[PDB]
Structure formats: structure tokens, C-alpha cells
Automatic annotation (TrEMBL), chains A, B:
It comes from the Eukaryota. Signal peptide: none annotated. This is KH domain-containing, RNA-binding, signal transduction-associated protein 1. It is found in: Cytoplasm; Membrane; Nucleus. Belongs to the KHDRBS family. Residues 10-108 form the K Homology domain. The gene is Khdrbs1. The chain holds residues 26 to 140 of 332 of the full protein.
Length: 115, 115
């Protein structure tokens, strides 16, 4: 049950696949991160969500990715996953849902680019 | 992972406690259902969510509730739960979140009545 008087926050997280199969040559990573990373910075500030691009291809630097993968460090474990956008929000229940809804709608604009 | 090209719908459900402890004498059931059930009908139409009041006290008819409880029918199993609002939505991921966010915000108006 959600108790609206609880002091617990709700967390919501989603991993939204980047649809590389539907758009095999579209540069989603460059488009979402933006020059210098200012598109995704702005996307986070605008949505109030934590949003990251994870999975293989997310660094657009095959060589770097391979070196970090092979190091074994757990913080680079995501480099083996399918490319995706990882959205994380927290808050009181009503607010967490509003944050996630908004983040999901703005991210979908990037991921279905011919819509 | 959510695949935005999947034909699967997402379902979201929440059980939001009616805060009887914070407002021991407030008639939440009458207020949410409304005369004839037109408040909750309208609430569903406005939000696009399935919304029901469940749990003990939800029928405001102690006698009826006891008779239906003691019958053993699984569809009345909820009558033993704490009074709550059960919100259910379905749809493509972005839409399901938007539906749940909206439903949660309108329901919270009913459940924190001195806000």
C-alpha cells in the first residue's frame, strides 16, 4: 500500500531501449547527449529526472569502451548491455509518477525521431 | 527493458491507503464515490484510469459487508483489507505513466482534504 503520510520516498526506474534496429544508422547517442553533453544536461534539468545513456556504444569510442569493459570494474558493467536510456526518479508517490511521466515523454521524442 | 516498438502494454497499479488515522471522522467513501457514484465515475472518465474504493468500510453498509465477507466469494476478499483507493491503468509505457501520474494527483486531492 502507498501511505501518503509515510516519510518513505518512492523510486521509479526504467531502461528504455534505443531502437537501433528500427533506425540502424541514426546517431541517437550524439543527439541525446548533445555537443559537450548539454542536451542531456538540459533534459535532466527540465524533467527533474536522472537520465543516462548506457550500454554498448554509449561512449562512442569503441576503443575506450573495450578497455573499460576488460578492466572488470563493476561501474562499467553496463557497457555489455543493449544501448538504452536509464531514467531514475524519486520522491513522494504523486511526484515520482509525474517526474517519470514527463521524463518518459521527452525521452520518447528522441527515440522515435520520425514521429 | 522497455521496447517502445513492443506490442505489449504496460500496466501500473497502486493501492493508496485512505488515511483514516489522520482524519478519523472524515467520510472519504461518500466523498470519493459521490451521490449515486457520480464523483468516482467522473473521476475515472477525467483520468482515463480504473479507480475503485476497496477494503473494509468501502460499501458503507457494515451488514452487507459482513454477509459478503462470510460468503467466501473471492471477489469480496478485498473487504478484509485496509480501506484504500485502487488505481489501475494500462497502455504504451509513456501513456501508462501519464495516466497513473494524473490519477494519483486527482486521488491525492481527495485523500489529503485539508491540503
Amino acid at each position: 500500500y502507498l501511505d501518503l503520510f509515510s516519510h518513505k520516498n518512492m523510486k521509479l526506474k526504467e531502461r528504455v531501449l534505443i531502437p537501433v534496429k528500427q533506425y540502424p544508422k541514426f546517431n541517437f547517442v550524439g543527439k541525446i547527449l548533445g555537443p559537450q553533453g548539454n542536451t542531456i544536461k538540459r533534459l535532466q534539468e527540465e524533467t527533474g529526472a536522472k537520465i543516462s545513456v548506457l550500454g554498448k556504444g554509449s561512449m562512442r569510442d569503441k576503443a575506450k569502451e573495450e578497455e573499460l569493459r576488460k578492466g572488470g570494474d563493476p561501474k562499467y558493467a553496463h557497457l555489455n548491455m543493449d544501448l538504452h536510456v536509464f531514467i531514475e526518479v524519486f520522491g513522494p508517490p504523486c511526484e515520482a509518477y509525474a517526474l517519470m511521466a514527463h521524463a518518459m515523454e521527452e525521452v520518447k521524442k528522441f527515440l522515435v525521431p520520425d514521429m
